[PDB]
């Protein structure tokens, strides 16, 4: 009877940090994947199943749209088969991915003068994440041989570091909001 509400995830006031990505399941709807593709207000739009046209020529069981914000310079890791500090420790899409990655600069909103530290990213983990995992722990990372007894200090590092977005940064280090739609009926096009 009505549009899938992308206006809820893409045009939303605040975006979640990558370590703690937000995910919206979408159902009992169907929307055009060709206002997004023909938007032209997005710097990235790459699909891994089939092309953005036939997609709205098909119906799926359920569609999910995860959303977070990273450095533009790391968007190349939101894809199957990649490795980095974001695809291993914060967010990892499977090598059998079917869906589309979409991303645009957010430097007007997510960056601040004097730095915006609301955006965190995990920087230490003892092994990478399995596909679509979400780790929100904050336990002190022990990087030595001696335990930390719960005190941040040498070799005892609190695991989340903050993107220090400032508006005067370089574009490869400026805020990119990202939305990843994955596909597995209730919605179609």
């Amino acid at each position, epitope marked *: 009877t009505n549009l899938c509400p992308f206006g809820e995830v893409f045009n939303a006031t605040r975006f979640a940090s990558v370590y703690a990505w937000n995910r919206k399941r979408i159902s009992n709807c169907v929307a055009d994947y060709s206002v997004l593709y023909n938007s032209a207000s997005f710097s990235t739009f790459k699909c891994y199943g089939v092309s953005p046209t036939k997609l709205n020529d098909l119906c799926f069981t359920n569609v999910y749209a995860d959303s977070f914000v990273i450095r533009g*310079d790391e968007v190349r890791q939101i894809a199957p088969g990649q490795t980095g500090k974001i695809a291993d420790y914060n967010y990892k899409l499977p090598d059998d991915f079917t869906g589309c990655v979409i991303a645009w600069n957010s430097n007007n909103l997510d960056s601040k003068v004097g730095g915006n530290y609301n955006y965190l990213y995990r*920087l230490f*983990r*003892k092994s990478n994440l399995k596909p679509f995992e979400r780790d929100i722990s904050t336990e002190i990372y022990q990087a*030595g041989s001696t335990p930390c007894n719960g005190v941040e200090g040498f*070799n005892c590092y609190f695991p989340l570091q903050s993107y220090g*977005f*400032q508006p*005067t940064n370089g574009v490869g*280090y400026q805020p990119y909001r990202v939305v990843v739609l994955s596909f597995e009926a209730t919605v179609c096009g």
Partner: antibody
Amino acid sequence: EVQLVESGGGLIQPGGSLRLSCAASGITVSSNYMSWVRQAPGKGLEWVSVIYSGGSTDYADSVKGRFTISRDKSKNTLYLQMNSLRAEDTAVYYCARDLGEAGGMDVWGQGTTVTVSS
Amino acid sequence: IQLTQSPSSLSASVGDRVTITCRASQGISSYLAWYQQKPGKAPKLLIYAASTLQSGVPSRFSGSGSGTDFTLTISSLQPEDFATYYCQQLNSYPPAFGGGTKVEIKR
């Protein structure tokens, strides 16, 4: 207490191969980002390679395909294999624990010179 | 990104206040670390996150800066401070480092 101690460098004919070791103590090699930094005679500091806790590895373009980095967790050493060596690879090679932006490379090795000559 | 520190060589008497700068080409927020390399020995992390001093380093060394202009100050030069100092970019994986700056001590 905490000290990286490298070895393995010396004279090695070009096209040749060599493997340096960098045994740590106090720091677990498999649990930090450990990188190899090298310094050519009279020049600046050039990062060669890095190996995240997680297992991923990254290398500078000047070294991709010729050198591989790894670690024996049961000896806590971190090694770096040198293969198909050039005259451009002559340098002191330091291995240190890169702590990202939570501090910099704060622990460094003593350095072990590699000289690629005929 | 490339960092370009200057002055390439510098020389000042003991007790003087010395300042070296690093200019980054793109804008790196507060991701810079300054190391000091005595001849023959490996470097020592002197400061991270532009202004945070590393545990053990004496307090007569201090960083300020953000964006593209970073400054390393030695507030009162002592005789053993002659070395080479290099800025480094934390946050860009191929770690860009600066070219180096040789402080010599006058007398």
